[PDB]
Every structure is written in C-alpha cells, then in structure tokens.
Symmetry: C2
Subunit: 367 residues, 2 copies
C-alpha cells in the first residue's frame, strides 16, 4: 500500500486459496473438505485425549530443546536425536532450509509444477528457481541432477512420494540420485507421505544419514491427522541438524502440538488402522473417477490425482463446479501437462459418498 514502511529491504520491496476463504467467497459451507490433503479420519482417540489432558498446561512454553519428542522419534526410528531437528511442520522446516543455504540470486532446482510452498520460500529469500519438467508423471531424478550440475545450484528439492501426482520412485533410485549430487549441493527429500508409501519407496535411514548434504523431512500433518498442530521433523547429520539452532525460534513449538505428536507416535495401532482406511479411500476415488470416464493415477499418498482426459480449462471447470454446485473442495496442479489433472484427497465414507454422487453430475453437466 501507499501506507507501507518505506525502507523494507530491496528484496522485500520486489516480492493457494484456503477452504475458509472459499466458503466466504461462495457463501456456503464446504460439504466435503478434500482439497488440502488434511486427514478427515482424524488423529487417534488417544491423541485427542492427550490434547484435552494437556490443555491445562498451555500456559507453559514448550521445552525449547524438544527433548521428549526427539527421544520418542529416535526410539521409533532407530536413529539418534542428534540427527533430528523439530520445526513448524515441513513447511516451516523448508523455509528454514532455504534460509540456511540460499543467498540472493542463487539458483535452486525443483520440479516444474512441484510443491509450491517450497517455491514460495525460495522466492522470498531471493533465490532463482530452476525447474525441471516431470518425466512420465514422476519427479525427474536424472533431470534434477543435471540442472544442479548446469547451475552449480546449492539446493535441490525432491518429494518422494510426490505431490501433486502421487507417484514415487524405488528407494534405490532415490539413494543413487542423492549420492550422485555434488556434496556442495543440499538435497531436501520431502517425505510428507512416508506413512502411506510402500516400504520399498523409502530409503533406509542408514543409507543417507551420514551425508552432510542430505536432509529428509517428515510430518504429523497427513496420516497422523495433526495438520492444525504444525509438527514436523528432519533427519540429517548432527552438524546439519545443529544449524537449525542458529535460526529457529527456540520456544516456537506449540506445547499442545508437541504433546499431540508424542501421543500420535505412541499410537502405531491407530496409524496402521488409518493407513488402511486411506488406502481403501484411494481405491474408492479410483472407482469413482473411472465411473465418470476419468483416469485415476497410482498413488502412494493420501490423495489421488485424476487425469480428466482433456485440457486445463476442463479440469478447472470440474474443480469450480464441485465447489459451486456441491460444496466439494478439491484442488488441481498448476502447470501443463500436470494440470490435465485434478487432485482429490482421501476421506471417510460420508465424503466419498458425496463425491460419488457429485462427480458424475458435474461431468454430465459439462458435456
């Protein structure tokens, strides 16, 4: 505005619609909230109990060392807490990673149409984004490697499994990619979808944990059902993990969120149950898509990408009509040819039943 402070940095001077904003725009409530990959299955009953029990302690700051959470993670994962950093979701950690490495004008390599929050952080720190097209619906490992080399980029992003296509690579291919990078380039390996992936997609911890130039990011926001709590963590060498202590808000963690995450980790039975429900919902979405003449894509995530078989304007019309006519909130990718697709999050049966009724009608109404 004309009212802004006149001496923001030159970078600052040069610089997704959420579901609540959609409701305000459309003047209606969302009937199926299946567009942001939030887990409507919810966190475990034991986690809800832990939150309610923790409420009375919310006057205290969280432990700035995150000791109990790091220990719990370390015990679960079979690695040391010295290898672990805690942050405000993967999104918060991604911002910190960009800050740690990216100077104004530095090139940063990612996939064309890949996870947009990463791109937001890169731009906000003055990085120059270098994008690599997907190769047959997968993030192109060989192409990412070459772009890094061409630019001598200090940072590269890979999500495995991928958002928004839901695709994945075998662990051995991801490891080979990571090992091939120059040690002067940091890889952030975004494993937001660890919990829903086939085990053979995920590198063993020991395969990468000694590399100073690899950091892996995981979250409680997806399968664990705690998106609103903002708890993420990274796995790296201890020297790389320690760097977060130079630039993090030490008391920044939500005390209730940390309690919830510790409880979530403890309830592996619930995680097993919910991941089976997510898988079932992926199959249901695939059936619904196919019944409407669309092409669902294989997925290792908590959503299904669906190829709508025409162009981007058709996919957009489907998203908009689902919201306008049925109060169904989905999303779509933002670049060709990925944007031939829509992306539908998994959900309980009530939402699936609504989607099953609505999607054919939308497709019929567009013909």
């Amino acid at each position: 505005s004309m009212s802004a402070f006149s001496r923001f940095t030159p970078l600052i001077q040069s610089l997704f619609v959420g579901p609540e904003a959609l409701e305000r725009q459309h003047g209606r409530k969302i009937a199926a909230r299946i567009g942001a990959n939030e887990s409507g299955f919810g966190p475990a009953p034991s986690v809800l109990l832990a939150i309610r029990q923790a409420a009375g302690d919310t006057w205290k700051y969280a432990d700035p060392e995150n000791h109990d959470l790091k220990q719990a993670l370390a015990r679960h994962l079979g690695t040391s807490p010295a290898n672990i950093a805690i942050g405000e979701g993967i999104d918060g950690l991604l911002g910190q990673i960009v800050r740690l490495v990216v100077e104004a004008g530095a090139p940063v390599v990612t996939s064309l149409g890949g996870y947009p929050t990463f791109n937001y952080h890169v731009a906000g720190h003055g990085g120059r984004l270098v994008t690599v097209p997907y190769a047959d619906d997968r993030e192109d490992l060989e192409g990412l490697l070459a772009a890094v080399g061409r630019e001598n980029a200090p940072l590269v992003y890979l999500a495995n499994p991928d958002n928004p296509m839901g695709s994945w690579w075998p662990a051995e291919r991801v490891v080979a990619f990571a090992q091939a990078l120059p040690e002067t380039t940091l890889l952030v390996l975004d494993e937001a979808y660890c919990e829903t992936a086939p085990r053979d997609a995920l590198p063993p911890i020991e395969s990468l944990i000694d590399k100073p130039n690899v950091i892996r990011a995981r979250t409680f926001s997806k399968a664990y059902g705690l998106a609103g709590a903002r708890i993420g963590y990274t796995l790296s060498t201890p020297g790389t993990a320690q760097a977060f202590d130079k630039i993090r808000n030490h008391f920044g963690m939500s005390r209730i969120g940390v309690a919830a995450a510790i409880a979530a980790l403890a309830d592996q039975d619930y995680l097993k149950e919910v991941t089976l429900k997510i898988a079932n919902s992926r199959q249901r979405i695939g059936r619904i898509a196919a019944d409407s003449g669309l092409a669902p894509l294989p997925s290792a995530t908590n959503f299904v990408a669906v190829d709508c078989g025409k162009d981007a304007s058709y996919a957009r019309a489907i998203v908009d009509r689902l919201m306008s006519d049925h109060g169904i909130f989905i999303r779509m990718p933002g670049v060709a040819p990925l944007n031939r697709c829509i992306r539908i999050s998994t959900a309980p049966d009530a939402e699936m039943d609504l989607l099953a009724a609505a999607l054919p009608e939308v497709i019929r109404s567009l013909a």
Copy 2:
C-alpha cells in the same frame, strides 16, 4: 563455527553464527516446585479457554485458516481498529524474527538496549545485522539514547519494550509517542507491548497516536496475562501496507488451529483477564515483601514479574538463582549484563508458589552469608 558433518555450503553468515526449565529439571533430576523464571502465567488461561481448547481438539486435523480471518476480526473488535492493520504470528518472538527479516540487510545497524530482550538480539544477529546497544538509564530503556544511536547510525530498525523486560520499568505514553514521532520515517520502531495487559493505562499510547505511522509496529501477545504461552499467538498493529509485508514472508498455514481457537476465547473472556491482572498485581506485591524480608530491593513493575536488586555483584545473584533451583526446586532467572545483573527476576504466581518462595529465599540468603 560449524562441525565437520555440517553441509559445507550453508551461507557464510550461517557458518559464522537461556536454559529452559525442562532442561533444568533434567540437570537437577527433580520436577520444578515453583516455575517462576520464564514469565509464564501459572494462574493459567480462563476456564472458558480451556473449554474452547477441549472442544477444538477434534478439528486439529485441519490446517488453520491461512488468512486468520476470525482472529483478526475478533482483535479488530476488541481493539477498535481495522483488521487491515493487524498481522498474526507465532508469538511476539515469531513476529520479531519476521520484522528483522523485513528490514535488516547484512551489516545494517539495529538499535536496542544493552541487556534488553535477548530474543530480539538473536534475530538481529541471525540476519546479519549489527547490534548497536544503548545502556539503560536508571532502570529504564533510555529513549534519548536510543534516538541518538538511531540518528548516528541511520539505523533502519529500533526496538523498545514498554513495559520493559527484564527491569519491569515503563515510560508514560506521552514520552513513548514523542520518541516514536521523533524517529526518522525511514527507521522502523518495533514497540514491544508484551506487557500491555499488566501496565497502567497511562503507559500505553492510544492506538490513534501511532496507527497512521508507516514506521511503527506494535507487538502484543497471548503468552503472558492471557495464559497461553504454549499456544504461540501474537499480533501486531501497524498501517495496512506494513501489515501486508508479513504476507510476503510468513508461513501462511503456520498458525496452530487450537491456539487460534484459544486466543479467540481468551479475548472474549475479559472478566477473567481483569481477575488475573489483579492477581498478578497482588503477586508482585507479595514478591516485593518476600524480597524486602530477605534484605533485597524490589524494583517497581508493570509486568508479570519483579526485578530484585540483590545489592552485591553478579556472582551473588547467580548463586541465589542456582541455590533456589538446586536446593528448593525453585526456578527464577536473572539479567545478563551489568549493572542489570546485580538483579534477579522473579515471575508472579499463585499463592502456593509464593509460599514456597517465602520459605526458601531466606534460607538461601542465610546459606550464602
């Protein structure tokens, strides 16, 4: 410094770069009996806020509204201002980091008080700013000295806390407004009002006195009187253009969904806030009595703590802090620079904690003679 296993191409700045109570419990192998060192409000948030948290628990699978619309609307109503003037962040500490990021280029001078709020200094250093520190004047942040340092350095950023941490002192609103209006319009003032709720009304500038200034931002929190430190909810008051700059560099979905619900409920329960601010005031008086009974000198306060001059040197004050913890499980803190570090800082608390402190402090002082 960085270790041999750290990524070898962290920025040159990065390469060049308080004990919490939980760590103290681990070190001493005991639970804290009186947690009165981090200015957390042991009075707690309102009963209605606890209910709101428990009711919101089932929705925690959803991300918070990235626009923070309902919270901004609630704050706008409470404050009597436009929601366009309001930015939301992860406490004042989170907002301070953002403010530094918005203004501070490597090497830029940033003015603050010597021994003033340390998290601000942490953020400045972390963004490559050059800290320019101004000694306190008689236990107050030296407005004249801050203004001189800004002028000398043409500093783009200056920090003022009113009321102050760690001394608890304050300036009248008219002096703060005069200070703010004397700064160059090319210098941003962050006016840290963490202690708004416990301050005398005449310490606080009216919103209208500063709200049209593009170079003033005021920061407030739910962490202190409202009893929600663990929820991490802070907000700022500024012009809309200044508020909008946060949208360029903030983690849009970063807010705790339960924390937002708690903050909205906390705002609604002004009867509870009134009650708790009176309890905090009473506890300050009790701490003053306890201090005086042990031959120490409590300082006036407009915060939720009392600074106490222990009348000797920094090593004496340190010994008091350490013995209270080791021998009695009592957690307090002290300032980190002379001559402020002649002092200890004791947070307010309910009667159970005050009673423990009243028994323990004389024993500690006696043991040190």
